[PDB]
From Swiss-Prot, chains B, D:
Entry binding sites for Ni(2+): H76, H87, H89, C95
Entry-linked Pfam families: NikR_C, RHH_1
Entry keyword annotation includes Metal-binding: yes
Family that this chain belongs to: Belongs to the transcriptional regulatory CopG/NikR family.
Name recorded for this polypeptide: Nickel-responsive regulator
GO molecular-function term, one example from the UniProt record: transcription cis-regulatory region binding
Signal peptide range: none
Cofactor descriptive note: Binds 1 nickel ion per subunit.
Cofactor(s) named in the record: Ni(2+)
A GO-annotated cellular component: transcription regulator complex
Alphabetized UniProt keyword annotations: DNA-binding, Metal-binding, Nickel, Repressor, Transcription, Transcription regulation
Highest taxon, organism lineage: Bacteria
Gene: nikR
């Protein structure tokens, strides 16, 4: 086997070590090795996708802007689930379909802007 | 068992007649009774004092009054009544929304109307599901 | 104008009269006349539709049966919203699309059976 | 600031290497650091003691173990954690489900795993949104 040495900051190490004692790992090396294993494990043209994001609806009238943006590409949209989590925040999940290339750009149009948080895209190609 | 006499204008009776025949009704009393039972049934479904769920669906033009924002702002105004909302972008202009609500059937009802009323919003429909 | 006389049962009349005094209608005739007005007021090949229904998921494994039924016609299905209202009951709203004729039959396949309650179909033709 | 030495097997290092280059990483430490930050970030997101919402998505074959029924039965088993579920019939065989959850992030997390684990269920993914 081989060895790779990396420099890690204190807080990150405090969090890694926290999970180390608990999770029952001998040390940092073993924990990191497992995390890498899963990360790498978790890695077509047509398919589906799930886009989730959080945003304040009033902010910049963002709600209106996101809906029109989606309507500009409604052909790629199957449907959206919306949950009014609090007085100002909205949680939306858009199920998208079509060309993975166009879906990915459509995703950038929606979440790559101010007022949108926790944006995540999950692709599911056929 | 009571015979109730109803006074109807010509235009209205012709409508009741035409619509009735297309739908297979051969006489007016049966037709009127079905409408009445249906309608009274829904009203009783929308009464204060009882908890439950409801389904509110409607079609709206998102560009309108920035109707998109107002419909959401209003939902947030009463977010204690909202479970979740499914939205389908019909075409470039229209949005199909289905809001699932919970709480007091009467309050839900009053809320639905405030929504279905707004201009730009068409095909509105409420279905209360009392506990 | 004209007059039509109808026979109505006691309970129904008790409910109509209840709404009469409250709603501020002079009498049965005026209330019925308004109800008819709305009913009649509220009345294409391609379009959308909203199907809602309630059912006990465990009952006859109904949940499994409804999903396959929908999958048999998945081409007509856009998406379904599901809310687990209690321990045994489920509330589902299926947004359907396609030929109104096929949508209507597809609706019968889903809600016209035992264990399904409050089934309602709303058509929205283009 | 601490230098941490990690011991990796040949196969694993080759994978890290290949995947890294395709994704534009020119060296191993940066790649490993990004993975670590990302991963630790999610874990901290799934901790008991904090309330919030979550999005759980997965694809499953409805015919399977009558998986359809078990997935729903299980959801009902913890329906206090469930807000609502969007379901999309991908094709004749597969179902895309997106369940929105609320409650204690740790409990939600444990629930998600119980679901993502089941056989027949693929592409599972959890995203916790702590209050
Ligand atoms: O719970 C029983 C039924 O309740 C609702 O049906 C409604 C129906 O959607 C409505 O259209 C009809 O109205 C009948 C009015 C008939 C008029 C008379 C002549 C002119 C035009 C129609 O009432 C029934 C209720 O019984 C549901 O849509 C249906 O799926 C369910 O099985
Ligand atoms: O909150 C910041 C970001 O958080 C998530 O991004 C993730 C991304 O989805 C994941 O793929 C990446 O992993 C990087 C791991 C890179 C590996 C190194 C070499 C081998 C293959 C990948 O981390 C970022 C977080 O910073 C969201 O998906 C993204 O929309 C958001 O803007
Ligand atoms: Ni909202
Ligand atoms: Ni829309
Ligand atoms: Ni359910
Ligand atoms: Ni399905």
């Amino acid at each position: 086997m081989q060895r790779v040495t990396i420099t890690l900051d204190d807080d990150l190490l405090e969090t890694l070590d926290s999970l180390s004692q608990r999770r029952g790992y001998n040390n940092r090396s073993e924990a990191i090795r497992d995390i890498l294993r899963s990360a790498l494990a978790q890695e077509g043209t047509q398919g589906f996708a799930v886009l989730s994001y959080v945003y304040e609806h009033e902010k910049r009238d963002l709600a209106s802007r996101i809906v029109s943006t989606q309507h500009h590409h409604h052909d790629l949209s199957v449907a959206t689930l919306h949950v009014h989590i609090n007085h100002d925040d909205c949680l939306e999940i858009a199920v998208l379909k079509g060309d993975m290339g166009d879906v990915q750009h459509f995703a950038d149009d929606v979440i790559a802007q101010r007022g949108v948080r926790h944006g995540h895209l999950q692709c599911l190609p056929k």
